[PDB]
Write a protein that binds this ligand. Structure first.
Ligand SMILES: CCCCCCCCCCCCCCCC(=O)OC[C@H](COP(=O)(O)OC[C@@H](O)COC(=O)[C@@H](N)CCCCN)OC(=O)CCCCCCCCCCCCCCC
Ligand SMILES: CCCCCCCCCCCCCCCC(=O)OC[C@H](COP(=O)(O)OC[C@@H](O)COC(=O)[C@@H](N)CCCCN)OC(=O)CCCCCCCCCCCCCCC
Ligand SMILES: CCCCCCCCCCCCCCCCCC(=O)O[C@@H](COC(=O)CCCCCCCCCCCCCCC)COP(=O)(O)OC[C@H](O)CO
Ligand SMILES: CCCCCCCCCCCCCCCCCC(=O)O[C@@H](COC(=O)CCCCCCCCCCCCCCC)COP(=O)(O)OC[C@H](O)CO
Ligand SMILES: CCCCCCCCCCCCCCCC(=O)OC[C@H](COP(=O)(O)OC[C@@H](O)CO)OC(=O)CCCCCCCCCCCCCCC
Ligand SMILES: CCCCCCCCCCCCCCCC(=O)OC[C@H](COP(=O)(O)OC[C@@H](O)CO)OC(=O)CCCCCCCCCCCCCCC
Lengths: 793, 793
């Protein structure tokens, strides 16, 4: 149920469920000694750990076929070594993090926009993949719970009829969903409206997801020493444990997975064995895949060669690996050894400080900063020679030295400067910090219960991290922005002079992005305007400025050519609508398929309707007639005015650009703003105007003459309007859409008919051009679209 | 591995495996009392039997989706209530019988040729279905054997490594088969050459076959009272028990299924419970589906309405139901009750006699006789009022009275007369009789072991059944057959006068079929010749005459219009090749796409090559030149002559039909036989003749003039040659073909180039016409095609 959590109480409720889960871990693990857990790790039958490596390998092979199946569903057949990597390194993170910037979403985006998909199709790949895992895990858990409510029924002393009956309830619900969605037929089960694929496709997907959950239950089943349950009893436990640990949005499914397995198997087998198998499960299944995903980038970077997809995936992988590294550092700083460096109960507080600093550096590394690289490299080095002095500890030292190795290797990857601390907060990284802190508190209360200042110090360090986490332009800038609009390309940005939109610049001075702030996030207007080389340097700087004041950097109507370095900044693009573009050198007045426009023009030829080519100083002759016709087209919509879209009643902006008129053979009845550039390379309009002198036979010639004059000056093409998205592309959607995409199309049919319908643009036979809205920080474009909307109105 | 058993040692080896299995049943059931088994049937918790009915219902719902999936694979989308019936009544028989006339094969044929498929596609439906069940049962048993070699490992005291290792062996073999057959690529694993379908199709098929085997293991698992194993342990037992009971070709998988489950679960649970669950399994899963399949025909016959498919399926269903009825009669005659009608150890021998008589009547009813109806109806009535007098016995009396009800209902279904006993033997019905006899011997040795004349009497009755199972035409007939060729239609049958082919007739006198005998089977030549109404009456009479001398009634080159009542007789059609037909009223000498023939004719115009229109009495001028040119075209192939195909060196047959010649401008160098009828409705040729005066430029005009003269007399069309089957239709094949179809195509490219290649026929631009060979008795067309072949040569 992605893009439905619209809150910060989701961030609070996630760590609430983790607090309840960790309290239940400490409840269910009373009479176990930490020394006994260390004993059971040190004696664990190395054939069993090798077999756990084998089953993790089979699990990630099935995850590769999840995604290859997804790409065969939407027709986009991509080559296989560029899909094995982008879904062996999408589940190496998705099994670890579930945040905005670190999830399956913001890695499929960053690894497929570089690879060659369309952002209207990565939201099909992601959505089919997440329906695949969720619905397949529900079917698999409810079928393997159906066959055995007796091998696991009495283990929690719940009778076999009830545990089987809830599995029959889940299977009846999912059979109802499939039988509703037999042939198309989007079935609205609530907010989310599933539209299941072919029966030949969800069955292949069900095999792939059942082999995934089988070879990921068997990783833990080989590590549990000689249970009183078989394989499938443990498989029905595992498909409830994962089925709740991913249901509660916790990072990696940490606490809920742990507490379900401890609550289920402590009655069966010895609790030290289950803790020693769960810790050695989290290592083998959630850290070894990160290490292999890192090394298969770094080795190919040193030395067939997939350096582009490695360059787009390495910050995400390192930022998801540093978070588990920080969990390991804090959990191994709190658990004691006798010989400790009292460097001058407060001497291992340096190590916990380094661990929390490196997960803050992980939040930096996903944002791909430079201070993140310095802090993470040096903090890992300090942890290296302040943890190697104690013992050998090949897991700790080797894993952390691998982090240092990779992070020295990827220095040339990124040099982007910003302030590591001055970004305020996301909904997810607070959950990361708080899960590390609360898990550390539970490790401390767990360990020193059999045999403080360090506890109070770790809590005070976490509170200091929380406090540090808590821690229109001048007419010269507007005129210089107008000069940048002149001396460069796209003429869409002639909405620059109307004010109300803050304008930042670049260091080169010839590039700008135009703001606008509505809620907890400020948006943009068209696209960064300027030469090509100043745009990617500025597309990061915008988002850095947006996070610098604790806001999200939504975009609006961006180009498909922008995507290749738009998605690198952490921008989930979304399909919005297509912008009608008519090339002018490939145009004829009737041709074979333009004569409807010729007859509509000749409808106004007999009226003799005319035009104006007037100047930026030709205001004082027209202005009160402009006021009265403004009253008319405000009476057309019955008095509701919009910003961010058109030019309002403006004494300067209306007379700013050269405009053009519909006449009463000399008397102004309707006008039109025309928007050019100095470079003569592209021109546009924005507004059409109604009169009580123009019926449906003359909704065109006021604009047809403008098209002919823009042909007459010698422009290359012409950006007329922007249309909402058609019914055939409302057909091509994804399974787990919700009210989000419906209100994308409602925003389409709500704000894009103030100039004309899609068929009205189609009357001019245009070649369409898609425009997107990019959203920062992995948040819902329900929120982003409404932040655009309430800034329109 | 169908169409590879080519023997009677398969029939011997099947009952050998059943003898070993029944001896192992009697071995493993020493200390069990028959009274205790009756106790455990009478106390069996009626909720458990209702739940077994539910799981049988789910199993046959999945069997319906086996076949609906199969019909969606080959594109032929058929309506669903005509597929639910023809695969709820194809597995109601296939789970009971595995013979020639009673299997999935000879019910898919009889229920799809009526329904609307092509016999080149029912051999795709059948073959995809049998690969589906076999390969899916192997994958399912090897996967559910993989997860648990510990819940069922020590039950037979075999260590868990070996039972898991053979499952890894099976899964590695099947993964090798799939990875070989990724994209097309027919992988020859031996005699059988699997070519697996789409990954989107065998996965859906794997779900359907795993839900089948799950809901058929659970029918028996609900009947076993409180095992020491879970569900999936019993599922891994069941997928070995079925996986060997269908591997050994035994009817219903009787003895092998029984002995595997007794051998596996007698060590776990009490043996009386396993016998009481296996008998009540065979009832619920193999007799209740026959009863429902019968009643859903008979009720719809009395009263939406599918009377055609019921009329084609009811004899197969009744003949597979009477066999289990006979097993029940013999097994309930041997098992004793105290009060018995001593009508005057030999008074219940009447009941065993009635049971063996009714399974002989079942062999009659599949062949759809009339004495079969009389013997089966009256023998069931005698069993009714000589078994109802003993006790109530609602299962026995109700089941048998249902048989009497259905068989009175289907009197109007069939009235076909033949001798019920005088058919000699099939490979399968001897296995039916012998499995009933040996199972009866084991029931007798089982029951009277705790506490004979009846045993010796049952053995003598079976030996009497075995002994009773052990129990060119005149020139008037040839000339009358030539008169039937004259006064009626197809001119293919002008091979009638050459002798060597026995000619039977009909009772109406104006219809005939022409024999030819090679091995243990005699074949036919073209098609029954005559009016339409005398053909279906004769198409049964041919097969009755063939079984009357203990032989199989193969056909050769039959029409697609014959299939609708050809498949009713029990004739598995097979695609053979297409017969080139050129309509003459829709023909032009060059048109747009015939001018190659015009230029090839003008190649011989400058030679001035000519023809003959000579008579049946114009022999004595040409005959020695015919002898020398016969020496030439015997020197063409280098001296190897064929029967059954053309006219040989014949003093009567060569001069019989009007022939036509290639000349040395008057001197005979090459001839051609031309074949007409009196009705002027269709004409043909058979033989083209080589000369040492005709190169590749004149392989045509000798025949082109014949085509023009057959146009000139005024015929409708022209049966020139018969071509082998093309490469695109050697592409459209089925998965479990073997050397059979390969030698069908080898027979094609081996015997059909003595007149010309497929492109040689394509030079004349023909409209193709498929011709089939029908095979009786469910036997392989390897055998039938070679019986045609060694009668050609
Ligand atoms: C207590 C009562 C509550 C019940 C109410 C149920 C309502 C359900 C409504 C649906 C809301 C879903 C919201 C989640 C959205 C989200 O968060 O995003 C999408 C997610 C990520 O998918 P992602 O791509 O990120 O992959 C993640 C993989 O890595 C996981 O990782 C790990 O946890 C690893 N440790 C293990 C790896 C495993 C193999 N790789 O997918 C989803 O749809 C999640 C839906 C899951 C639904 C499960 C339903 C419950 C199952 C129980 C079965 C029946 C038995 C009942 C007995 C009680
Ligand atoms: C002891 C060592 C020997 C091993 C050697 C293996 C070689 C295999 C070579 C393959 C030859 C196949 C020859 C059969 C051909 C034939 O006869 O015809 C095709 C059949 C019918 O198909 P049909 O359409 O007729 O349906 C039938 C349904 O009704 C059955 O009925 C019943 O029995 C009911 N009582 C139950 C209904 C169940 C649900 N409905 O299908 C086939 O391919 C048969 C192939 C089966 C292959 C199984 C392999 C072994 C499985 C074991 C798994 C691994 C574990 C190993 C541990 C030891
Ligand atoms: C009700 C089920 C619902 C549907 C789910 C069905 C899914 C089945 C698919 C399972 C595939 C993976 C199988 C993993 C099973 C592990 C079995 C196992 O326990 O391993 C034992 C031994 O394993 C081996 O010897 C090697 C097994 C290798 C399995 C390789 C699988 C290949 C076949 C997979 C099928 C798919 C083929 C394509 C693969 C890409 C070790 O156990 P143990 O004796 O150590 O246990 C005692 C105690 O627990 C302490 O350990
Ligand atoms: C390792 C596995 C390999 C792959 C196989 C996986 C296939 C799983 C699919 C199974 C579907 C059918 C499930 C049948 C399980 C039967 C469970 C059972 O035992 O029934 C119990 C109770 O059953 C019920 O209460 C009702 C169960 C109804 C199940 C209906 C299945 C619907 C869901 C099927 C999934 C598909 C959905 C579409 C269906 C067309 C009765 O047991 P008991 O307590 O009597 O046992 C004690 C002793 O044995 C004596 O009996
Ligand atoms: C081991 C498995 C053994 C048992 C498996 C039972 C399944 C039988 C299928 C048999 C089968 O394939 O028949 C197909 C049938 C629907 O087919 P339709 O006629 O709708 O297909 C028409 C078109 O889809 C064809 O293109 O399925 C059902 O009727 C509902 C079954 C629900 C079964 C419960 C849920 C099963 C898993 C759902 C997973 C969804 C994943 C979504 C990913 C996008
Ligand atoms: C519960 C099940 C849980 C585990 C299921 C494991 C299966 C994973 C599939 C994952 C999957 O679908 O990937 C598909 C992949 C092959 O796909 P391809 O790349 O060849 O597909 C290309 C074209 O087929 C696409 O049209 O399968 C394999 O590599 C071999 C798998 C063997 C698995 C063992 C045998 C499985 C059953 C075979 C049944 C054959 C039935 C034949 C009927 C005609």
């Amino acid at each position: 149920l992605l893009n439905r959590y619209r809150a910060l109480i989701v961030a609070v409720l996630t760590v609430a469920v983790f607090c309840i889960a960790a309290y239940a871990i400490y409840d269910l693990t009373t009479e176990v000694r930490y020394d006994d857990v260390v004993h059971a790790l040190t004696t664990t039958k190395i054939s069993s750990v090798l077999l756990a490596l084998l089953f993790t390998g089979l699990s990630f092979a099935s995850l590769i076929f999840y995604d290859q199946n997804a790409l065969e569903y939407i027709g986009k057949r991509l080559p296989f070594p560029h899909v094995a990597l982008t879904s062996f390194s999408a589940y190496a993170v998705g099994n670890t993090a579930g945040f905005g910037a670190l999830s399956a979403g913001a890695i499929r985006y960053r690894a497929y926009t570089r690879l060659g998909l369309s952002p209207d199709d990565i939201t099909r790949v992601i959505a089919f993949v997440t329906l695949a895992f969720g619905l397949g895990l529900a079917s698999v858990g409810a079928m393997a719970l159906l066959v055995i409510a007796d091998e696991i029924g009495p283990l929690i002393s719940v009778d076999g009829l009830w545990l089987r009956l809830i599995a029959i309830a889940i299977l009846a619900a999912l059979a109802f969903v499939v039988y509703a969605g037999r042939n198309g037929r989007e079935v609205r089960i609530g907010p989310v409206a599933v539209r299941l694929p072919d029966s030949r496709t969800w069955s292949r997907q069900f095999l792939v997801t059942a082999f995934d959950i089988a070879a990921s239950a068997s990783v833990l089943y080989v590590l549990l020493p000689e249970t009183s349950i078989g394989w499938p009893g443990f498989f029905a436990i595992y498909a409830i444990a994962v089925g709740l640990g991913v249901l509660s949005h916790v990072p990696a499914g940490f606490g809920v997975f742990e507490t379900i397995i401890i609550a289920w198997l402590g009655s069966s087998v010895n609790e030290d064995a289950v803790l020693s198998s769960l810790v050695l499960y989290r290592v083998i299944y959630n850290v070894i895949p990160l290490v292999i995903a890192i090394a298969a980038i770094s080795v190919a970077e040193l030395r067939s060669s997939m350096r582009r997809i490695g360059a787009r995936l390495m910050p995400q992988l390192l930022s998801a690996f540093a978070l588990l590294l920080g969990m390991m550092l804090v959990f191994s700083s709190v658990t004691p050894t006798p010989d400790h460096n009292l460097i001058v109960e407060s001497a291992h507080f340096l190590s916990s400080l380094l661990g929390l600093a490196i997960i803050v550096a992980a939040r930096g590394l996903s944002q791909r900063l430079d201070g993140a690289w310095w802090v993470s490299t040096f903090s890992a080095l300090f942890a290296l020679f302040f943890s190697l002095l104690k013992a050998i500890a090949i897991v700790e030292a080797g894993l952390l030295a691998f982090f240092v190795f990779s992070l020295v290797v990827s220095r040339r990857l990124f040099k982007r400067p910003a302030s590591l601390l001055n970004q305020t907060l996301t909904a997810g990284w607070l959950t990361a910090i708080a899960v590390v802190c609360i898990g550390a508190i539970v490790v401390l209360f767990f360990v020193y219960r059999d045999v403080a200042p360090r506890g109070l110090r770790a809590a005070l360090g976490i509170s200091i991290v929380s406090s540090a986490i808590a821690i229109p332009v001048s007419d010269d800038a507007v005129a210089r922005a107008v000069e940048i609009v002149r001396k460069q390309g796209v003429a869409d940005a002639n909405l620059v002079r109307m004010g109300d939109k803050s304008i930042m610049f670049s260091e080169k001075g010839d590039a700008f992005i135009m703001y606008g702030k509505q809620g907890r996030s400020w948006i943009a207007l068209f696209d960064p305007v300027g030469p090509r080389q100043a745009l990617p340097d500025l597309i990061w700087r915008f988002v850095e400025t947006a996070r610098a004041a604790g806001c999200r950097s939504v975009f609006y109507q961006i180009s498909p050519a922008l995507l290749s370095y738009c998605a690198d900044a952490g921008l989930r693009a979304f399909k919005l609508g297509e912008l009608a573009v008519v090339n002018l050198a490939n145009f004829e007045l009737k041709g074979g398929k333009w004569a409807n426009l010729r007859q509509t023009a000749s409808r106004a030829v007999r009226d003799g309707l005319e035009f104006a080519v007037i100047e930026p100083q030709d205001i004082p002759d027209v202005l009160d007639q402009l006021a009265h016709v403004s009253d008319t087209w405000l009476a057309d919509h019955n008095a509701k005015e919009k910003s961010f879209s058109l030019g309002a009643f403006d004494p300067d902006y209306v007379c700013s650009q050269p405009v053009g008129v519909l006449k009463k053979d000399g008397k102004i009845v309707a006008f039109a703003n025309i928007l050019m550039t100095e470079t003569k390379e592209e021109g546009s309009v924005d507004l059409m105007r109604f009169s009580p002198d123009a019926p449906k036979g003359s909704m065109d010639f006021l604009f047809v003459q403008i098209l002919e004059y823009l042909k007459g000056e010698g422009f290359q093409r012409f950006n007329l309007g922007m249309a909402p998205l058609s019914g055939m592309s409302r057909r091509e959607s994804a399974p787990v859409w919700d009210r989000v995409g419906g209100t994308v199309f409602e925003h389409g049919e709500r704000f894009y008919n103030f100039k004309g319908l899609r068929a009205f643009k189609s009357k001019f036979h245009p070649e369409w051009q898609p425009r997107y809205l990019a959203v920062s920080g992995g948040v819902s474009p329900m929120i982003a679209l409404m932040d655009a909307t309430f800034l329109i109105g």
